[PDB]
Amino acid sequence: MDEDATITYVDDDKGGAQVGDIVTVTGKTDDSTTYTVTIPDGYEYVGTDGGVVSSDGKTVTITFAADDSDNVVIHLKHGLEHHHHHH
């Protein structure tokens, strides 16, 4: 049996509306992964829940669960737009 962990970037400024797409990673409860958080144009790192977040916040140690399915939620707000491609 394979267990999953979904890393969903959401816009904490826009009522949790999705930024980009979901990162679907799978493995075993025995395995733990290290994921670097990607900050796109005009979006600000608020916080992360699920997946054990590092003291710097820019990396997150995730672990796969058949109970939870480790839904890692990365919250982002709107900063100052300098007129260009949103992502």
Residues linked to residue 31 through DSSP beta bridges, in sequence order: none
User: Would you give the end-to-end CA distance of the chain in angstroms?
Assistant: 35
Count the Cβ atoms, other than its own, within 10 Å of residue 19: 22
Q: How was this structure determined?
A: NMR
CATH class in words for 1-87? alpha beta
Residue 36 identity (one-letter amino acid) = T
- Provide the 8-state DSSP code for 87: -
